[PDB]
Design a protein around this ligand. Structure first.
Ligand SMILES: O=c1ccn([C@@H]2O[C@H](COP(=O)(O)OP(=O)(O)O)[C@@H](O)[C@H]2O)c(=O)[nH]1
Ligand SMILES: [Mg+2]
Ligand SMILES: [Mn+2]
Length: 233
């Protein structure tokens, strides 16, 4: 795929140190970023809370209306305060084509926020079983068909919304939704610190996942792992 057809969309209500860390990594690798929400009031829930972020989906829904018909375009959505990018657009798109997915979500060890949904997920052996909405990549048309279904409160949970759609077998089959079970593109660090090591790559520090033997592009220092991102770059 042509990197000119990839857009990275993120949300930031302020230019925090985390957002600037994200943005520097994106610019170093020559990604094109679209940032939603700068200077707006965050309504996604008190940052202490372990659920929320629906405002992100509402803003993404509005932006995706521009791309509803762009069959050529690939969009990666990521959190920005606790994410860094560690490889090139060419590497990312090669791995995306290899996934065979039209919308690939990051995966994690914990079924959150509704533990009772865990039984509805396919069992996948040693891979990461559950959906995490801090990063996903897919065709713009497919993403629009997902986010246009958002009709909830700004402090409702984004992850629960995407989870319930992913868990609908008919929809998952029709739209070709998938999870990145072996952290080939997305590395969620919460629940996987025992799996990762630092690796020098052209005088940059990135992550190798030694459990799956992968070199993820997107590193998400979610939950209490946020400070681990300061070793990368
Ligand atoms: O005041 C805020 C809080 C959050 N965010 C955005 O919402 C994302 C989700 O927040 P967090 O990473 O804490 O969520 P979690 O990874 O725990 O679901 C952040 O990375 C930012 O992109 C924002 O723009 N402003
Ligand atoms: Mg969350
Ligand atoms: Mn996050």
């Amino acid at each position: 795929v042509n990197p000119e057809k990839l857009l990275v969309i993120t949300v930031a209500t302020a230019e925090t140190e985390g957002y600037l860390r994200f943005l520097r990594s994106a610019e170093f690798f020559n990604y094109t970023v679209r940032t939603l929400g700068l200077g707006e009031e965050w309504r996604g829930g008190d940052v202490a809370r372990t659920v929320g972020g629906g405002q992100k989906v509402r803003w993404l829904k509005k932006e995706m209306e521009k791309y509803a018909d762009r069959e050529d375009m690939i969009i990666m959505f990521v959190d920005s305060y606790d994410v860094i990018l560690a490889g090139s657009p060419t590497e990312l798109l090669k791995k995306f084509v290899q996934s065979g997915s039209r919308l690939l979500f990051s995966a994690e060890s914990f079924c959150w926020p509704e533990w009772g949904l865990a039984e509805q997920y396919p069992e996948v052996g040693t891979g990461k079983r559950f959906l995490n909405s801090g990063g996903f990549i897919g065709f713009a048309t497919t993403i629009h068909q997902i986010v246009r279904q958002w009709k909830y409160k700004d402090d409702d949970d984004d992850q629960l919304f995407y989870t319930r759609l992913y868990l609908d077998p008919g929809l998952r089959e029709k739209l070709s939704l998938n999870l990145d079970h072996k952290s080939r593109i997305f590395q969620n660090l919460n629940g996987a610190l025992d799996e990762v090591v630092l690796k020098f790559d052209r005088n940059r520090v990135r992550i190798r996942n030694v459990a799956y033997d992968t070199l993820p592009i997107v590193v998400h220092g979610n939950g209490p792992t946020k400070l681990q991102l300061n070793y990368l770059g």
